[PDB]
RNA sequence: GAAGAUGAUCAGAUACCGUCGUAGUCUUAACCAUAAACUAUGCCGACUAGGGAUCGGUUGUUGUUCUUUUAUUGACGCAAUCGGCACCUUACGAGAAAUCAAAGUCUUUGGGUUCUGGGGGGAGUAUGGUCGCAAGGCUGAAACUUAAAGGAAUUGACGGAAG
């Protein structure tokens, strides 16, 4: 059965951007999905995404523009200390100058760059580059 | 196709696509006002009615249940609401 | 390795098929695996139609045919040359050979 | 059998592809002409070479030969296949004066900015 | 040998060992 | 006495095409090796492996000897040549010919701060040939070429001096090891990095601006 | 890619597909470059002025290169009401 | 954008509709669906000739971008496109590929008919696969005349036409030649009638 | 899902699974079962002093054809009798 | 038709072939729990490519045939769908390859979870335990021995295989 609504959404994105489709439909939607997508726009990896209300869990239509390489989740959402981030970024990101490790903390869903800026830590949630 | 308008699909493909697979699910079933041949009395009947609905005024069965849409008896006219 | 994708039979969405005996040697072969041929032959050879017609007491009598459905195992059919070994690519061709 | 080999076939046909005009449909003059054009070590080989040469010319006269070009075949084919009947065979003259298109395609004409007379034909096969 | 016959050969040998242990 | 038979060969014979990056910028196929002899005179070749492969006949083995040759300029251009021939010299000589024909550009990148010239790869790249998968990870300015001797020599001729390499599979098979390593190093210009995100207009092919110089 | 002093140390800045925006490789021998001319109001092709597109070898193999040009030529005015966004 | 004279003239709408260019194969693949207008109840499929005519101008504009007409190669395996391409090669200066296509003509540089065109035009992708396949080896764009069952891989411009027609194939090559010559300026303008008749480019049987 | 549990609370299942499966590794099994201590003639040691009971020369295996010259030695520490080779040219005589 | 006996063949055949034939094959009450029990492919879930068929249900439409003369008949036909058993092409992708629409979305390594394997033998053997009337099933080693065993494909050679 469906165990991770985030993992299913990111899988549809990867299977759409390797194929070259410029859009993808995500079902179902969640605030973790919507906030994970917002981090992508701030770094430009996607265009606008459209949330469709159906009086249910929802549906999301995303616009892909091909400057993304791979986005995925890390299961489970491991506990990540501040000193742990250096290990995690090395093994997940292709280089030290680009790529993002998305963390969920009590300060919100955010990438490892601004996570180091405000010096708080939480669960690792995914990666994007 | 690489670029498609997912948010506004043409209604032509919406009419042929399954009700749960459309952008937002919507019943294709409806409600009818059935005029029996015996008398004129508004009786609201579901299209996919499972029960042999009879008129209130006259003891005449309006529809006989079928696997899908119920078939109204001869002399029964329906108007969609 | 796997010589055929269909595994030499025609069993899919099925557990068991009742076997048949080879016509040649009475060997039990699964029904969907057996080589089956429909045979509708004349009672008499085409040369024997002139002498049968003249000896007939009925004017314009039609000779009944000889109907049979033959069953073979893989060994029965190959030895009798009902089927022949095909190349690795031509094995996939399952349209009947053009003869009639 | 009397099947010519490739060394007599290709050597002969190069001669046509280079010296088409001065050859002739006669063996003996061709036999003497091939004696001066190509260096042939054996007279049997030259008689083999010249024999296929004339036979190819007999084929060139009765039609277009395959695999031989001598800068005059195709040029002569250039100005011959200009044939055009006076009626365009596409104009609306064979008909009564209007297209014979289907009834379904009639909507296609109306959809575009075209008002063309049409005899509706309903095949529905 | 053939794998099936080696399995059957051991069964005959295995039954011999069981019968011998039955004496004691 | 070299007469080019291709349009780009006539262009490179004259001063029309002077830099190999112009060839790369338009993916123009290369068929005659004399082209880059003029363009990349500084090419270093070395024989990586020589093998003898036998074909069974009705009488006996028909042995042909196979050589694998790596070519590079130590400045970001590298190629790999594998050719079989009856003799060792001809196998090496013909492999050197086809090694040149496959020279590709690589992207040197920065690990950490971008001080100085690029020295490493811009990202992790992997190439697979057969069972051999070769992964190149960028390394700091201190580490050398952390790789096996066969893979090390390939990375030297490409100008990379800082790189980690991890290999899986039957790496003792040199041919698959070098092809997989060659495939990986060619992925440097296949990974879309943020600095390459800036869109640029499409310059026309040099075969277009010089149609008359290369007609025949 | 550019270094500390700011000079563009990147040699061979590659090009990007007009359909998928993927980087076109150096040996991407299936890739093409469609060049469509400019036409003046008189109906004559303008000399040395072309509308150019870059196609990845990927999209040509999948058969979507035909649809890619039709949309690209639609957006740049080279075609009218031939490609539909709504499918 | 484009002058309004480039729209489909009623005269061409007569010629295109006359040769049954609008009939497309009964089986239509998913890629050629946008060029389909409607279905005929028999089973025949209608080509959107409005889109068809607009593809003629687009492809012809690509040919005019090629500087040397000798760099445009046309090929045809069908006899119905055998005659057309030759005078298309003659009128435009293009290079014809008559009859069978020898493999290695583009990839092998020691062959006799070794060409490196900047553009290839194909009568029918299904019957001319070898030329299309070799084009994907040396970076050559391809323009193909495609029906509704024509495969769409490694073809850039699909001009929807009836490839199984006597007069449809010749008409398209006529239309392309007319538009290609108009853009270079050989034909003075878009209103004059052309010397070349539609009957020319039409395949002729050996009977005459 | 790779067949192995991925939950954050699945550390016991992962630790148990690997612990059982290390018994398939021959080096690990000999260490924990202590086979060298129990059954090896040296008792797990490196060297061993013994008493030569006689001198015996052994045929080599195929495809080689020779006679390898060893000795039969009885061990002091554990009473076992083994065969020990004499690697060199011509010191069969030096051992008695 | 195991077993058995018999007539052949053969150097020998207590084998293949022929003739009988006992248990068994069938059934009722119980045991047994094993198969190349195979799709040699665990289950649940989402996505990725085109196409034509086919079964069940459902939804709309016929120069069709038919009840009956027609409708509310039925069959047929044309379209959609959900579910299935599958099939054909291609390989974006995977694989050592055969091949695979899953064996893809796996060094760009993480949806959830159960089970199993660590070179070939010895050996699924010994012993202990447990279940069974037994036959046996399940769990299950070690000593010692060995540099290979094996998978897919290629060339040749050979075949009491075909063309
Ligand atoms: Zn009533
Ligand atoms: Zn048999």
DSSP letters along G4-43, please?
TT------S---B-TTT-PBPPTT-TT-EEEEEEEE-TTS
What phi and psi values does residue I42 have, to the nearest 5 degrees? -80, -5
Q: Which residues in G lie closer than 8 A to residue F117 (C-beta atoms)?
A: 3, 9
Cβ(I66)–Cβ(I49) below 8 Å: no
- Residue of G15, G21, G27 lying closest to F104 (CB–CB): G27
Q: Give distance CA C85 / C1' J163 (Å).
A: 10
Residue of D nearest to H36 (CA): D108
Closest CA to A62 of A110, A30, A22: A22
Distance between CA atoms of H139 and G29, rounded to whole angstroms? 5
Q: Give distance CA G34 / C1' J133 (Å).
A: 86
Give the burial class of A55: count Cβ atoms within 10 A of its Cβ; 0-12 exposed, 13-18 middle, 19 or more buried.
exposed
Resolution in A: 2.6
What phi and psi values does residue F78 have, to the nearest 5 degrees? -145, 145
**Contacts (Cβ under 8 Å, ≥6 apart) of G16:** F199, F200, G22, G23, G24, G54
Kindly report which amino acid residue has its CA closest to the C1' atom of nucleotide J151. Answer: C1
Distance between CA atoms of G38 and H183, rounded to whole angstroms? 10
Distance between CA atoms of I85 and I64, rounded to whole angstroms? 17
Sequence-distant contacts of H72-76: CB under 8 A, at least 24 apart: H72/H117, H72/H118, H72/H119, H72/H121, H73/H97, H73/H115, H73/H117, H73/H119, H73/H120, H73/H121, H74/H120, H74/H121, H74/H123, H75/H101, H75/H120, H75/H121, H75/H122, H75/H123, H75/H128, H75/H131, H76/H122, H76/H123, H76/H124, H76/H128
Sequence-distant contacts of C89-97: CB under 8 A, at least 24 apart: C91/C4
Number of neighbours of residue H199 by Cβ within 10 angstroms: 19
Closest CA to G14 of G34, G28, G30, G35: G28
Residue of G nearest to F192 (CA): G23
How far, in Å, is the centroid of ligand 2 from the Cα of C92? 24
Distance between CA atoms of A36 and A33, rounded to whole angstroms? 5
Distance between CA atoms of I68 and F169, rounded to whole angstroms? 40
Please give the interface size between A and F, counted as residue pairs whose CB atoms are below 8 Å apart: 23
Cβ(H122)–Cβ(H96) below 8 Å: no
Burial F35-63 (b: 16+ CB within 10 A, else e): bbeebbeebebeebbeeeeeeeeeeeeee
Give the burial class of D28: count Cβ atoms within 10 A of its Cβ; 0-12 exposed, 13-18 middle, 19 or more buried.
exposed
How far, in Å, is the centroid of ligand 1 from the Cα of B60? 6
Concatenating the DSSP letter of every residue in F106-166 gives ---B-SSS--SS--B-SS-EEEEETTEEEEEEE--SS--EES-HHHHHHHHHTT--SEEEE
**Contacts (Cβ under 8 Å, ≥6 apart) of D55:** none
Nucleotides of J under 7 A from a protein CB: 39-52, 57-60, 63, 72, 79-82, 84-89, 92, 94-100, 103-119, 123-127, 135-136, 142-144, 146-147, 151-153, 155-157, 161-163
Cβ(H151)–Cβ(H126) below 8 Å: yes
**What's the start-to-end Cα distance of chain A, in Å?**
29
For residue B39, say whether it is annotated as part of any ligand binding site: yes
What's the token pair of residue F37?
Answer: 């002899």
Distance between CA atoms of E2 and A96, rounded to whole angstroms? 61
Q: Give distance CA H182 / C1' J97 (Å).
A: 56
* d(CA B1, nearest CA chain A) in Å: 7
Cα–Cα distances (Å) from I92 to F7, I71, I73, I89, in that order, read 81, 9, 14, 8
Helix and strand totals (H; E) in chain C:
2, 4
Query: In the block, which residue shows the tokens 């996570």?
Result: A115
CA-derived radius of gyration, chain E: 11
């Amino acid at each position: 059965t469906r165990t991770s609504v985030l993992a299913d959404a990111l899988n549809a994105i990867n299977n759409a951007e390797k194929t070259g489709k410029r859009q993808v439909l995500i079902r179902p939607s969640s605030k973790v999905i919507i906030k994970f997508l917002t981090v992508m726009q701030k770094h430009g990896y996607i265009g606008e995404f459209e949330y469709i209300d159906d009086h249910r869990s929802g549906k999301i239509v995303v616009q892909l523009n091909g400057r993304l390489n791979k986005c995925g989740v890390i299961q489970p959402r491991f506990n990540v200390k501040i000193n742990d981030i250096e290990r995690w970024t090395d093994n997940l990101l292709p280089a030290r100058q680009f790529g993002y490790v998305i963390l969920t903390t009590s300060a919100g869903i955010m990438d490892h760059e601004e996570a180091r800026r405000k010096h708080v830590s939480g669960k690792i949630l995914g990666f994007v580059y | 196709v690489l670029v498609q308008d997912l948010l506004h699909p043409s209604p032509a493909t919406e009419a042929k696509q399954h009700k749960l697979k459309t952008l937002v699910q919507q019943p294709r079933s409806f409600f009818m006002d059935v005029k029996c041949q015996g008398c004129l009395n508004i009786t609201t009947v579901f299209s996919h009615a499972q029960t042999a609905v009879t008129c209130d005024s006259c003891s005449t069965v309006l529809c006989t249940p079928t696997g899908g849409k119920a078939k109204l008896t001869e002399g029964c006219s329906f108007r969609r609401k | 390795p796997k010589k055929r994708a269909s595994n030499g039979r025609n069993k899919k969405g099925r557990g068991h098929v009742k076997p048949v005996r080879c016509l040649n040697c009475a060997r039990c072969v699964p029904k969907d695996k057996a080589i089956k041929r429909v045979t509708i032959r004349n009672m008499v050879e085409a040369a024997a139609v002139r002498d049968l017609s003249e000896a007939s007491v009925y004017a314009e009598y039609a000779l009944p045919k000889l109907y049979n459905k033959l069953h073979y195992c893989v060994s029965c059919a190959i030895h009798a040359r009902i089927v022949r070994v095909r190349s690795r690519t031509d094995r996939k061709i399952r349209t009947p050979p053009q003869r009639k | 059998g009397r099947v010519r080999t490739k060394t007599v076939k290709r050597a002969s046909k190069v001669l046509i592809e280079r010296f088409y005009p001065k050859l002739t449909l006669d063996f003996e003059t061709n036999k003497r002409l091939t004696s001066e054009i190509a260096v042939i070590q054996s007279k049997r080989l030259r008689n083999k070479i010249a024999g296929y040469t004339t036979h190819l010319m007999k084929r060139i006269q009765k039609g277009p030969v395959r695999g031989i070009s001598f800068k005059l075949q195709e040029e002569e084919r250039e100005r011959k296949d200009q044939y055009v009947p006076e009626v365009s065979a596409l104009d609306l003259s064979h008909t009564n004066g209007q297209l014979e298109i289907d009834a379904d395609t009639a909507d296609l004409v109306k959809s575009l900015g075209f008002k063309i007379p049409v005899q509706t034909v309903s095949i529905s096969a | 040998m053939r794998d099936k016959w080696r399995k059957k050969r051991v069964r005959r040998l295995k039954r011999k060992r069981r019968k011998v242990r039955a004496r004691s | 006495g070299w007469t080019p038979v291709t349009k780009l060969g006539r262009l490179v014979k004259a001063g029309k095409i002077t830099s190999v990056e112009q060839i790369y910028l338009h993916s123009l196929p290369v068929k005659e090796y004399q082209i880059i002899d003029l363009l990349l005179p500084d090419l270093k070749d070395d024989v990586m492996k020589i093998r003898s492969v036998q074909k069974q006949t009705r009488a006996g083995q028909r042995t042909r000897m196979k050589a694998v040759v790596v070519i590079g300029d130590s400045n970001g251009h590298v190629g790999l040549g594998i050719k079989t021939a009856k003799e060792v010299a001809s196998a090496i000589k013909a492999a050197i010919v086809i090694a040149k024909l496959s020279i590709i550009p690589i992207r040197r990148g920065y690990w950490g701060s971008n001080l100085g010239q690029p020295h490493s790869l811009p990202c992790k790249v992997t190439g697979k040939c057969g069972s051999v998968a070769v992964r190149l990870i960028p390394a700091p300015r201190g580490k050398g070429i952390v790789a096996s001797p066969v893979v090390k020599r390939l990375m030297q001729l490409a100008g990379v001096e800082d790189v980690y390499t991890s290999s899986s599979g039957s790496t003792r098979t040199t041919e698959n090891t070098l092809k997989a390593a060659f495939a990986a190093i060619g992925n440097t210009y296949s990974f879309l990095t943020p600095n390459l995100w800036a869109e640029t207009p499409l310059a026309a092919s040099p075969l277009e601006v010089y149609a008359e110089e290369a007609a025949a | 890619m550019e270094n500390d002093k700011g000079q563009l140390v990147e040699l061979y800045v590659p090009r990007k597909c007009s359909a998928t925006n993927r980087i076109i490789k150096a040996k991407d021998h299936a890739s093409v470059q469609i060049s469509i001319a400019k036409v003046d109001e008189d109906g004559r092709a303008i000399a040395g002025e072309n509308i150019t597109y870059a196609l990845s070898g990927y999209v040509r193999g999948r058969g979507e290169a035909d649809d890619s040009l039709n949309r690209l030529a639609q957006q740049d005015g080279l075609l009218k009401n031939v490609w539909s966004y709504s499918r | 954008s484009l002058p309004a004279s480039f729209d489909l003239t009623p005269e061409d709408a007569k010629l295109l509709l006359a040769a049954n260019v609008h009939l497309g194969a009964k089986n239509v693949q998913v890629h050629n669906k946008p060029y389909v207008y409607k279905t005929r109840p028999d089973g025949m499929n209608i080509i959107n000739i409005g889109k068809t005519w607009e593809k003629i101008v687009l492809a012809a504009r690509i040919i005019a971008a090629v500087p040397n007409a000798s760099d445009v190669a046309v090929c045809s395996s069908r006899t119905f496109g055998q005659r057309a391409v030759l005078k298309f090669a003659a009128h435009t200066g293009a290079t014809a590929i008559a009859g069978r296509f020898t493999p290695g003509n583009f990839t092998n540089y020691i062959t006799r008919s070794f060409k490196e065109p900047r553009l290839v035009v194909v009568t029918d992708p299904r019957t001319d696969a070898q030329a299309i396949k070799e084009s994907s080896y040396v970076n050559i764009p391809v323009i193909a005349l495609t029906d509704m069952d024509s495969p769409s891989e490694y073809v850039d411009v699909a001009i929807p036409c009836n490839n199984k027609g006597k007069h449809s194939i010749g008409l398209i090559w006529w239309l392309l030649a007319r538009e290609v010559l108009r853009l270079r300026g050989i034909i003075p303008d878009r209103t004059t009638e052309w010397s070349v008749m539609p009957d020319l480019y039409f395949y002729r049987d050996p009977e005459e | 899902g790779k067949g192995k549990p991925r939950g954050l609370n699945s550390a016991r299942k992962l630790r148990v699974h690997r612990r059982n499966n290390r018994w398939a590794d021959q080096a690990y099994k000999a260490r924990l079962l202590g086979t060298a201590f129990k059954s090896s003639p040296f008792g797990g040691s490196s060297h061993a002093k013994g008493i030569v009971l006689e001198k015996i020369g052994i045929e080599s295996k195929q495809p080689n054809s020779a006679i390898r010259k060893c000795v039969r030695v009885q061990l002091i520490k554990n009473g076992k009798k083994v065969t020990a080779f004499v690697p060199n040219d011509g010191c069969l005589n030096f051992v008695d």
